């Protein structure tokens, strides 16, 4: 049941984002309702999250592949829908496996960002 409910919620989110994408392209992303901005951000993360590096494309991707167990697919997406990962950067979900890989990539991105901020601040 949890698998079914999560899948339907994901589909509904992506369906709505598609409809909002028509407005976004013409006018702009900033002409939308604040509620629809949250949906867009979650939908974009879902789209990035759905990507996965395959073990057979280590040449074209340049990265080690992943095997995601179904139980981690359900849990990771279910948490993302609830919004517990809103603080995570959007790009952290791109070309990764389970939620754990997302967090690890986010940590590395944060460390790099902190290093850049430290370099900029030290420049003063």
């Amino acid at each position: 049941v949890d698998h079914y409910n999560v899948a339907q919620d994901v589909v509904q989110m992506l369906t709505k984002y598609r409809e909002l994408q028509d407005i976004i392209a013409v006018l702009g992303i900033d002409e939308l309702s604040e509620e629809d901005k949250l949906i867009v951000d979650r939908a974009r993360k879902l789209v990035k999250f759905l990507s996965q590096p395959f073990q057979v494309a280590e040449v074209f991707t340049g990265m080690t592949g992943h095997y995601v167990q179904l139980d981690d697919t359900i849990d990771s997406f279910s948490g993302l829908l609830m919004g517990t990962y809103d603080q995570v950067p959007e790009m952290a979900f791109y070309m990764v496996g389970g939620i754990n890989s997302v967090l690890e990539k986010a940590k590395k991105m944060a460390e790099e960002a902190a290093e850049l901020e430290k370099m900029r601040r030290a420049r003063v």
Binding site: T84, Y85, Q87, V88, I99, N100, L103, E104, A106, K107, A110, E111, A113, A114, E117, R121
Partner: peptide, 30 residues
């Protein structure tokens, strides 16, 4: 209080999330 008397995979996700949130907050400060 009475709970004190007598009385893990998900913890790892919480731990990583807390660390990432801490890093994102620290960069904001300075």
């Amino acid at each position: 209080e009475a709970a004190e008397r007598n009385p893990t995979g998900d913890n790892a996700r919480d731990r990583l999330l807390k660390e990432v949130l801490a890093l994102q907050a620290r960069i904001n400060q300075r």
